[PDB]
Amino acid sequence: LPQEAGGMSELQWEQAQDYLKRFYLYDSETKNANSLEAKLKEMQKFFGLPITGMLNSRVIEIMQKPRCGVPDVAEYSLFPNSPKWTSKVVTYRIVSYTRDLPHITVDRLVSKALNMWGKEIPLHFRKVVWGTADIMIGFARGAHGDSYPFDGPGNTLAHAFAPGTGLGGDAHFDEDERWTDGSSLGINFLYAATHALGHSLGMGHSSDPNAVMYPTYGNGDPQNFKLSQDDIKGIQKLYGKRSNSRKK
Numbered sequence: 170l171p172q173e174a175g176g177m178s179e180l181q182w183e184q185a186q187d188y189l190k191r192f193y194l195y196d197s198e199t200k201n202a203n204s205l206e207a208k209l210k211e212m213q214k215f216f217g218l219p220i221t222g223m224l225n226s227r228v229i230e231i232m233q234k235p236r237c238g239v240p241d242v243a244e245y246s247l248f249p250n251s252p253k254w255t256s257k258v259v260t261y262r263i264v265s266y267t268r269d270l271p272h273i274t275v276d277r278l279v280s281k282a283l284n285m286w287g288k289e290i291p292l293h294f295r296k297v298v299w300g301t302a303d304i305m306i307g308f309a310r311g312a313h314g315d316s317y318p319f320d321g322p323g324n325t326l327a328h329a330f331a332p333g334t335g336l337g338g339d340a341h342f343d344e345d346e347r348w349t350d351g352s353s354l355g356i357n358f359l360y361a362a363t364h365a366l367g368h369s370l371g372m373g374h375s376s377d378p379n380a381v382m383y384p385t386y387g388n389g390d391p392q393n394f395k396l397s398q399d400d401i402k403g404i405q406k407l408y409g410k411r412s413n414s415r416k417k
């Protein structure tokens with residue numbers, strides 16, 4: 170429903186358990202209807218929303234669309250938490266692709282996305298064609314041993330882990346999903362590469378509709394496609410002092 174929040178049934182109250190369950194890789198708090206009722210104010214913060222304890226934005230509608238695969242906040246066993254790389258130079262290589270598109274597209278799409286971010290951080294991404302790279306972008310089905318399937322085409326569309334020496338900074342995208350650049354038959358990879366690989370920098374969802382990673386996005390695609398003041402500010406929080414500077 171255009172307003173889903175008060176047409177919210179059984180279905181949507183499970184998609185919330187679903188959606189949160191899939192990021193944490195199980196969370197003990199997200200199971201149980203009462204405990205979940207509290208957790209739902211936390212999930213709002215992962216949609217960027219400054220109101221926590223109200224549904225009013227598209228949030229419960231939009232969540233049923235394939236729009237986040239990578240966790241927005243990172244909880245991962247076996248490691249100390251830190252969304253940062255340790256070097257001044259990082260590397261990239263597309264190690265498997267969606268075979269609906271030819272490799273030459275999927276290769277270079279990520280090269281745009283990492284260069285968009287690239288400019289404003291103390292970090293350089295160089296491309297390598299010898300072996301493994303720092304960031305491995307791969308395409309897979311959800312049968313390959315990790316927690317929970319990607320579905321097929323539709324609901325949920327990737328997984329990725331925060332920057333670590335080997336295992337981290339890397340992504341697996343859904344290959345049964347349909348992706349695109351300009352040809353429109355898919356989800357646009359130019360945004361989805363940028364949003365995936367930006368959680369690697371530590372970033373969140375915005376509440377400003379001008380910002381690259383606004384989830385409740387409506388009709389009007391960015392034609393040049395650029396970072397805004399809020400998106401530049403999202404990097405300044407990482408390599409400066411932390412401050413929220415959104416206002417009303």
Ligand SMILES: CCCCCCCCCCCCCC(=O)OC[C@H](COP(=O)(O)OCC[N+](C)(C)C)OC(=O)CCCCCCCCCCCCC
Binds near residue numbers: 255256257258
């Ligand atoms: C030019 C006149 C002088 C000629 C002799 C110079 C000799 C240099 C000898 C040492 C060469 C290797 C140096 C190297 O690996 O530097 C690494 C840095 C990155 O260090 P990085 O990991 O960012 O900082 C370390 C911090 N840590 C441990 C916390 C992660 O930086 C790099 O990773 C970026 C540089 C990569 C170089 C790759 C090879 C380019 C050869 C190009 C030539 C092809 C034919 C023209």
Ligand SMILES: CCCCCCCCCCCCCC(=O)OC[C@H](COP(=O)(O)OCC[N+](C)(C)C)OC(=O)CCCCCCCCCCCCC
Binds near residue numbers: 262264265299300301
């Ligand atoms: C020495 C540095 C440059 C090497 C370039 C030539 C390499 C030719 C093959 C040499 C022996 C390579 C052995 C090898 O591992 O090949 C596989 C790589 C892919 O590594 P990766 O994509 O990680 O493989 C993933 C899949 N896996 C894990 C199941 C193996 O795939 C390859 O590396 C094949 C790449 C073919 C296309 C290379 C295009 C180069 C630029 C052409 C410029 C065109 C400009 C218009």
Ligand SMILES: CCCCCCCCCCCCCC(=O)OC[C@H](COP(=O)(O)OCC[N+](C)(C)C)OC(=O)CCCCCCCCCCCCC
Binds near residue numbers: 269
């Ligand atoms: C040097 C002057 C050249 C002048 C070129 C002038 C413009 C020519 C355009 C030719 C376009 C070929 C169309 C083609 O079938 O591409 C097939 C694909 C490339 O995928 P692509 O079409 O980029 O995207 C398709 C995405 N999809 C499935 C979601 C619709 O790729 C393949 O399936 C693999 C590669 C096939 C190579 C085709 C090129 C030779 C075709 C004629 C072979 C004649 C042999 C006698």
Ligand SMILES: CCCCCCCCCCCCCC(=O)OC[C@H](COP(=O)(O)OCC[N+](C)(C)C)OC(=O)CCCCCCCCCCCCC
Binds near residue numbers: 272277
């Ligand atoms: C002074 C002399 C100058 C002479 C002219 C330059 C000659 C060398 C050109 C090097 C390639 C430059 C053209 C090129 O990048 O084509 C890429 C396209 C699509 O890339 P895409 O990003 O979609 O288009 C890029 C440009 N853009 C965004 C501004 C529209 O690619 C395609 O759409 C191809 C789709 C079908 C085939 C897919 C698989 C191809 C495999 C490789 C076949 C063998 C090539 C040796």
Ligand SMILES: CCCCCCCCCCCCCC(=O)OC[C@H](COP(=O)(O)OCC[N+](C)(C)C)OC(=O)CCCCCCCCCCCCC
Binds near residue numbers: 277281296298395
């Ligand atoms: C003699 C040479 C003659 C050539 C004639 C043409 C000369 C150039 C004319 C203009 C060409 C395009 C200029 C350019 O910067 O294109 C960048 C593109 C697309 O950027 P895109 O994000 O679409 O637009 C960028 C601007 N933004 C963020 C504000 C929207 O981004 C790319 O297309 C990505 C490129 C990936 C390159 C893949 C190979 C990378 C290097 C690998 C090296 C390995 C070690 C050797």
Ligand SMILES: CCCCCCCCCCCCCC(=O)OC[C@H](COP(=O)(O)OCC[N+](C)(C)C)OC(=O)CCCCCCCCCCCCC
Binds near residue numbers: 287288289291293
């Ligand atoms: C077989 C393979 C052989 C490979 C040979 C490779 C030769 C490589 C030469 C590389 C020379 C690079 C020079 C340079 O400083 O480039 C970058 C800057 C802009 O960097 P910027 O985008 O600010 O990123 C800065 C650093 N960051 C990420 C850590 C914040 O650049 C600028 O500030 C000035 C830019 C002037 C135009 C640059 C070219 C743009 C069109 C690219 C066309 C490619 C046609 C083939």
Ligand SMILES: CCCCCCCCCCCCCC(=O)OC[C@H](COP(=O)(O)OCC[N+](C)(C)C)OC(=O)CCCCCCCCCCCCC
Binds near residue numbers: 283284287292294295
């Ligand atoms: C043999 C090398 C001798 C000279 C070596 C000089 C030092 C080179 C490293 C300079 C370090 C400081 C500047 C810096 O970080 O610039 C980085 C930028 C952006 O990195 P980033 O913003 O991380 O964008 C990553 C994507 N990438 C690598 C595909 C451009 O990179 C760019 O903006 C690239 C701009 C285009 C340069 C034109 C390269 C043309 C290659 C044509 C290859 C045709 C091969 C047949």
Ligand SMILES: CCCCCCCCCCCCCC(=O)OC[C@H](COP(=O)(O)OCC[N+](C)(C)C)OC(=O)CCCCCCCCCCCCC
Binds near residue numbers: 262276296297
């Ligand atoms: C004036 C025009 C100026 C044009 C400047 C264009 C930029 C030139 C950049 C050269 C360096 C780029 C390095 C690079 O990142 O290549 C990107 C891709 C593949 O990267 P790579 O990671 O090897 O791809 C993964 C492995 N793969 C292909 C098996 C799936 O590369 C490809 O996917 C390969 C593209 C088709 C190249 C085919 C050439 C066949 C030569 C055939 C004759 C061989 C000798 C008999």
Ligand SMILES: CCCCCCCCCCCCCC(=O)OC[C@H](COP(=O)(O)OCC[N+](C)(C)C)OC(=O)CCCCCCCCCCCCC
Binds near residue numbers: 298299300301
């Ligand atoms: C003046 C004194 C110096 C003389 C010149 C020295 C130039 C050396 C440039 C070396 C470029 C390649 C560097 C490289 O290490 O690539 C390694 C990868 C896999 O190595 P791997 O052992 O998997 O990882 C090595 C690095 N490690 C242990 C730190 C993780 O390797 C691969 O993935 C590809 C292996 C096949 C490479 C084929 C290279 C020649 C291509 C020949 C034509 C193609 C034939 C099909």
Ligand SMILES: CCCCCCCCCCCCCC(=O)OC[C@H](COP(=O)(O)OCC[N+](C)(C)C)OC(=O)CCCCCCCCCCCCC
Binds near residue numbers: 260297300301303
């Ligand atoms: C006929 C043609 C065959 C192919 C010719 C290629 C000739 C190339 C000359 C220019 C080489 C340019 C490629 C280059 O940058 O090689 C540097 C590589 C690593 O580059 P880098 O960008 O660090 O790769 C990083 C990859 N990562 C993130 C997984 C660690 O460095 C390495 O990883 C380590 C060095 C490995 C090779 C050392 C070779 C020693 C030869 C000793 C001979 C002794 C005879 C007794």
Ligand SMILES: CCCCCCCCCCCCCC(=O)OC[C@H](COP(=O)(O)OCC[N+](C)(C)C)OC(=O)CCCCCCCCCCCCC
Binds near residue numbers: 350351352
């Ligand atoms: C004798 C008559 C000669 C007539 C000359 C015509 C010259 C046209 C120059 C235009 C330069 C515009 C700047 C540029 O880099 O434009 C690239 C565009 C779009 O980049 P971009 O919007 O990222 O493409 C995304 C994918 N798309 C279009 C499917 C949505 O790329 C595209 O949308 C596709 C590229 C179309 C190129 C048409 C020219 C083909 C080369 C003709 C060479 C004639 C030599 C005599």
Ligand SMILES: CCCCCCCCCCCCCC(=O)OC[C@H](COP(=O)(O)OCC[N+](C)(C)C)OC(=O)CCCCCCCCCCCCC
Binds near residue numbers: 392393394
């Ligand atoms: C010899 C030296 C070579 C210098 C080459 C420099 C090349 C610079 C290219 C940099 C990248 C350009 C990308 C570009 O197309 O931006 C478009 C913008 C905004 O377009 P937008 O409204 O975002 O739609 C953009 C997508 N498009 C192009 C596919 C429809 O378009 C604008 O906002 C409007 C532009 C209005 C220009 C009216 C005239 C300004 C003065 C021109 C003076 C030229 C005298 C020769």
Ligand SMILES: CCCCCCCCCCCCCC(=O)OC[C@H](COP(=O)(O)OCC[N+](C)(C)C)OC(=O)CCCCCCCCCCCCC
Binds near residue numbers: 351
């Ligand atoms: C009678 C028959 C007529 C024939 C008609 C043939 C078709 C003519 C139209 C061809 C299509 C033109 C499309 C066009 O507006 O492309 C503009 C592009 C990028 O615009 P942009 O706003 O960046 O689009 C962003 C990418 N998008 C749409 C995918 C989100 O612009 C570019 O990417 C800029 C390319 C040049 C970049 C220059 C960068 C280096 C400048 C320094 C150069 C020094 C040279 C010495």
Ligand SMILES: CC(C)CCC[C@H](C)[C@H]1CC[C@H]2[C@@H]3CC=C4C[C@@H](OS(=O)(=O)O)CC[C@]4(C)[C@H]3CC[C@]12C
Binds near residue numbers: 268270272
């Ligand atoms: C001279 C004539 C007799 C032969 C002409 C050969 C042309 C150049 C074409 C036709 C058939 C083409 C291949 C088809 C098969 C593919 C798969 C394709 O994979 S994708 O997943 O990148 O689309 C990569 C290119 C490649 C190897 C093509 C290269 C280019 C290819 C050899």
Ligand SMILES: [Ca+2]
Binds near residue numbers: 320322343345346
């Ligand atoms: Ca899916």
Ligand SMILES: [Ca+2]
Binds near residue numbers: 304335336
């Ligand atoms: Ca890694």
